[PDB]
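Hello,

Following up on my earlier ticket. Below are the seven sequence lines again, exactly as submitted.
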Amino acid sequence: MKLNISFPATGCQKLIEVDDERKLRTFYEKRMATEVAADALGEEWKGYVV
Amino acid sequence: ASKGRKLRFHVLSKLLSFMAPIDHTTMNDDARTELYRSLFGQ
Amino acid sequence: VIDEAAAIPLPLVKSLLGPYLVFMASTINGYEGTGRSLSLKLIQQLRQQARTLYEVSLQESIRYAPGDAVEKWLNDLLCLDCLNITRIVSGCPLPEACELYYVNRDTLFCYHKASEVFLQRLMALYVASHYKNSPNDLQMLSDAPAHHLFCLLPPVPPTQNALPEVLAVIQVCLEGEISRQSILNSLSRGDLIPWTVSEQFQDPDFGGLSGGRVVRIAVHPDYQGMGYG
Amino acid sequence: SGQKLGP
Amino acid sequence: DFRRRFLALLSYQFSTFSPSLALNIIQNRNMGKPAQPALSREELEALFLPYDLKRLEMYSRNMVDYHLIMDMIPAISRIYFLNQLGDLALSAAQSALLLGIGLQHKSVDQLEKEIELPSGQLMGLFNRIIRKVVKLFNEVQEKA
Amino acid sequence: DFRRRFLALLSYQFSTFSPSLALNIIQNRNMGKPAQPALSREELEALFLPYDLKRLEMYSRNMVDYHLIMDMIPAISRIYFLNQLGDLALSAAQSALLLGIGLQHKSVDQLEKEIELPSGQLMGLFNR
Amino acid sequence: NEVKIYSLIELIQDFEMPTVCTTIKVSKDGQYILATGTYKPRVRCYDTYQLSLKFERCLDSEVVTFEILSDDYSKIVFLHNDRYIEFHSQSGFYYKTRIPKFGRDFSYHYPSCDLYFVGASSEVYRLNLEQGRYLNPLQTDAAENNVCDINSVHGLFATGTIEGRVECWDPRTRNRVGLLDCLPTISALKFNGALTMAVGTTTGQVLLYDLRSDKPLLVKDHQYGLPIKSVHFQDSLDLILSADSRIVKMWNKNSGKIFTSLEPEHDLNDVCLYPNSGMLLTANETPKMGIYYIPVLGPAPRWCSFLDNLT
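Thanks for your patience. The regenerated structure is below:
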């Protein structure tokens, strides 16, 4: 499971490998084009919405 | 009889053996006969 | 081999079949022979279920020659032979045009020829949907008190035959009118519905009310499910 | 008691 | 918090545990637990209606059926292991049966294999258990 | 009296009963009995601890793993099937799940054969 | 009025006729859903597992109604306003033949392989499938016959008439067992169970009838005068499913209490219910075909299992 994350306002892309199932539990059973609060990704991601 | 206005009983080859008879009726034949005599006010 | 297969409920019979060779045996018009309705259902299940079905019937006793006067006399006396439950009369409006009738116990069980024919009709319907017919159950009906028997009959025409066809039969036994003190004594140490309620809720008040239970309700096997009940 | 039962 | 979770979960998938193991987890000598408050009048009335309390009292004299009071035992079992209901002075063997009936929902026959005591004594043991239980309700009611 | 007795006895010998059959026992006359008052505030505090409320409310948002609230269901099922807590407008299938879990103590996979709905759906119905 | 209905993202792609949809029907297995539409009359079958259309087959003439003979999508019969019956095998078009007079509606008797034509003739035509020869005619002695239905319970065939008289026939021995008497024309007739029958009237009255008693058990009148095209029965909730073009009404079989009512943006040509599910499929006079999900009525269908999460 890899995450291809993009910030359009700055226009920057990054690829991050997440090996922990725990952090990916938040994204499971969710559809496309839906807003998700990705606080589970880590301490850097506080208040981020994807 | 023009344009098939009158019923005809010639054999139709393409429709021959088009289906096989399958029957699923629980009610027995003796019960069927008694019911129809008893139908409605009869 | 499954012996006395009529006694076993039908769902268990299906599992016992399996893919292996299977032998049946059943009792019809016997002392413990199951009624017509259950037997017809089983053979319908067997015929419905590369299986080759074989039906064999036995008509001759091993002890006495057929036609023995004792056997025929005893069979009618105890009403152990179930036959066609009733002649197929014209069907009636189900919840609309049927009236209950009160059969008199004294007049039913006297040995008049007309009464005997009606008794055989009632008994065959009575033990139709029952696992093992008991001669003892007849012993309760004819003499035991408060066992009131009720029959539902087609609307009578102006012209009628000797015996109307019987659609449904209900046997009701009246209970109650039992003293409070006897209940109090019994809890420390006249049928199912008074005693069981008394012991479960522990109410001495219950029992002093008069009420009856429906011992049996039956409908004609051909007409089963049309709403006579 | 309970520990003895476990043993 | 972990204990009260465990008390509810013996019904689900923890019933397969032997009664002895469940007793060992719930009670630990290392962390002693102070006794919970004795059963109050409003709390007892909510849990047990007077007909329910009447059934326990009169059956205590009878010792006949054992099928009238099976419903109340899981309610009774929770109170004892929650440190409530004061002290019932239940023995180690008696506590095992109360846990088995109330929480694991096992029949008496199955526990007979587990407890390995004879059923006649186990029945008599459970008879003693409820006896201590029933008067303690009466002590609570008389205090009102 | 019989109605409360039947709920407790489901976990001893009536668990073998199908959930649909058990529902027919509890609900009869095609009508409700004299309506009991909704679940009282004081009754709530005795029934569930403030931490217990916080766990159940938190799982509603996360919805990760039902085992955390698995202890709480048998208490919840008793309130609903005692005619308390008013009416939750539950469906026939959703009502059957509460009886299977809260009362019969059957796992979600075991109910899948009984309810005949797929285990993925039955988890979602439990979610509602 | 506490049902709070949903309306439907896209469950099946291209679930859209070009202009209008006349009839929508579902196969008995439930894996296939079939629909026909104007313009360029098409037969479009949608796969439930794949959520897409398997195929489309254009037709010469508009189809009044079609009935699914086979358990799968293999064998289908179309009746046309051009007096034409077209048979389609699994590969495609198979055979075509006409009838002397126009056919209003047709019903197929699975026993005896006899398929019945009810139309603009007093006689009701019969079609045998195992044998190609057309069977003997039966005369219903009423000028115009509008609707027909066959009961699966015990094989009873009843045809509606223009005068408002329902006539019951016997598929075996070809004898008229009885008559039922009740200006309004018989809009819709359905058989449900052994002893329950329903008749729709052009005035907007759906009448419950019992076989033994001539008097109707219950009466329900739509306040709007439009005829009721289709009536259905739901066994689980004992609901009788009544649809007219303006609105479709949900009501109980006994005492006639109303469950709920659904009014869409444009008129409904046809209404269908997926078996054992709260999902409702309606055919409208609109390129889009209606899909509505009723949670209280039933659970979501298996191939749309995720809707229960979405609610």
